[PDB]
Structure 1
Amino acid sequence: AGYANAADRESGIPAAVLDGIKAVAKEKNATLMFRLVNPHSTSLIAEGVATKGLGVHAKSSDWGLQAGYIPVNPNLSKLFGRAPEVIARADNDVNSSLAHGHTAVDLTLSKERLDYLRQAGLVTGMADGVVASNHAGYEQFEFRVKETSDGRYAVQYRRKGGDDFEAVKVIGNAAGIPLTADIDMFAIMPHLSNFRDSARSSVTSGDSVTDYLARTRRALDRERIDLLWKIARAGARSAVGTEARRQFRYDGDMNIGVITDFELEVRNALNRRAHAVGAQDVVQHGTEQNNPFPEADEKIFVVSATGESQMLTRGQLKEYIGQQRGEGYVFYENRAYGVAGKSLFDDGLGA
Structure 2
Amino acid sequence: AGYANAADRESGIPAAVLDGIKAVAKEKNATLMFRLVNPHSTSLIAEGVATKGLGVHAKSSDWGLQAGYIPVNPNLSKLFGRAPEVIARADNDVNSSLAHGHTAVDLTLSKERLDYLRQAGLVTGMADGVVASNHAGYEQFEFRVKETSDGRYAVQYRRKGGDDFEAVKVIGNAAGIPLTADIDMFAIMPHLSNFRDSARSSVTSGDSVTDYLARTRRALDRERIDLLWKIARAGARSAVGTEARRQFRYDGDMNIGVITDFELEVRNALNRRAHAVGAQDVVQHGTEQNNPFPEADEKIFVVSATGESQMLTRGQLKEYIGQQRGEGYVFYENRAYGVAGKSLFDDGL
Which TM-score tier does this pair reach, normalised by the shorter chain?
A: over 0.9
Are the equivalent residues in 2 in contact too, given 1:3–1:9 (CA < 8 A)?
Answer: yes
Q: Alpha-carbon deviation of 1:280? A: 0.2
Partner residue, 2:282 = 282
Give the distance between the partners of 2:117 and 2:45, measured in 1 at CA: 15
Deviation per CA, 1:142-178, whole angstroms, max 9, x where unpaired?
A: 0000101111000001111121100100101100000
Q: Alpha-carbon deviation of 1:125? A: 2.3
Partner residue, 1:193 = 193
Are the equivalent residues in 2 in contact too, given 1:118–1:125 (CA < 8 A)?
Answer: no
SS of the equivalent of 1:74 reads coil
Deviation per CA, 1:87-124, whole angstroms, max 9, x where unpaired?
A: 00000100110111101000111100000000001002
Query: TM-score, normalization: structure 1?
Result: 0.99
Give the distance between the partners of 1:228 and 1:236, measured in 2 at CA: 13
Are the equivalent residues in 2 in contact too, given 1:122–1:133 (CA < 8 A)?
Answer: yes
Give the distance between the partners of 1:292 and 1:172, measured in 2 at CA: 26
Confirm or deny that 1:127 pairs with 2:127: yes
SS of the equivalent of 2:201 reads helix
Deviation per CA, 1:23-58, whole angstroms, max 9, x where unpaired?
A: 000000000000000000000000000100000011
Deviation per CA, 1:267-310, whole angstroms, max 9, x where unpaired?
A: 00000000000100000000000000000012000000010000
Confirm or deny that 1:245 pairs with 2:239: no
Partner residue, 1:26 = 26
Give the distance between the partners of 1:240 and 1:140, measured in 2 at CA: 51
Give the distance between the partners of 2:134 and 2:278, measured in 1 at CA: 33
Give the distance between the partners of 2:257 and 2:221, measured in 1 at CA: 43
Give the distance between the partners of 1:50 and 1:298, measured in 2 at CA: 27
Give the distance between the partners of 2:80 and 2:190, measured in 1 at CA: 42
Are the equivalent residues in 2 in contact too, given 1:59–1:70 (CA < 8 A)?
Answer: yes
Give the distance between the partners of 1:344 and 1:130, measured in 2 at CA: 51
Deviation per CA, 1:50-80, whole angstroms, max 9, x where unpaired?
A: 1000000111000000001000001000011
SS of the equivalent of 2:339 reads helix
Partner residue, 2:149 = 149
Q: Alpha-carbon deviation of 1:196? A: 0.2
Deviation per CA, 1:297-350, whole angstroms, max 9, x where unpaired?
A: 12000000010000000000000000000000000000000000000000011x
SS of the equivalent of 2:75 reads helix
Are the equivalent residues in 2 in contact too, given 1:203–1:231 (CA < 8 A)?
Answer: yes
Are the equivalent residues in 2 in contact too, given 1:259–1:290 (CA < 8 A)?
Answer: yes
Give the distance between the partners of 1:126 and 1:197, measured in 2 at CA: 61
SS of the equivalent of 2:170 reads strand
SS of the equivalent of 1:257 reads coil
Are the equivalent residues in 2 in contact too, given 1:143–1:155 (CA < 8 A)?
Answer: yes
Q: Alpha-carbon deviation of 1:128? A: 1.1
Give the distance between the partners of 2:9 and 2:124, measured in 1 at CA: 24
SS of the equivalent of 1:94 reads helix
Give the distance between the partners of 1:174 and 1:11, measured in 2 at CA: 28
Give the distance between the partners of 2:155 and 2:298, measured in 1 at CA: 35
SS of the equivalent of 1:64 reads coil
Gaps of 5+ in 1: none
Q: Alpha-carbon deviation of 1:234? A: 0.2
Deviates more, 1:321-330 or 1:121-130: 121-130
CA RMSD, Structure 1 to Structure 2 (Å): 0.5
Identity %: 100
Give the distance between the partners of 1:274 and 1:57, measured in 2 at CA: 24
Partner residue, 2:336 = 336
Q: Alpha-carbon deviation of 1:126? A: 1.1
Give the distance between the partners of 1:291 and 1:236, measured in 2 at CA: 21
Are the equivalent residues in 2 in contact too, given 1:124–1:134 (CA < 8 A)?
Answer: no
SS of the equivalent of 1:75 reads coil
* Consecutive aligned runs of 4 or more in structure 1 exceeding 6 Å deviation: none
SS of the equivalent of 2:145 reads strand
Give the distance between the partners of 1:279 and 1:125, measured in 2 at CA: 31
Query: TM-score, normalization: structure 2?
Result: 1.00
Deviates more, 1:116-125 or 1:189-198: 116-125
Q: How does 1:262-281 map to 2 (within 5 A)?
A: 262-281=262-281
Confirm or deny that 1:69 pairs with 2:69: yes
Gaps of 5+ in 2: none
Deviates more, 1:124-133 or 1:302-311: 124-133
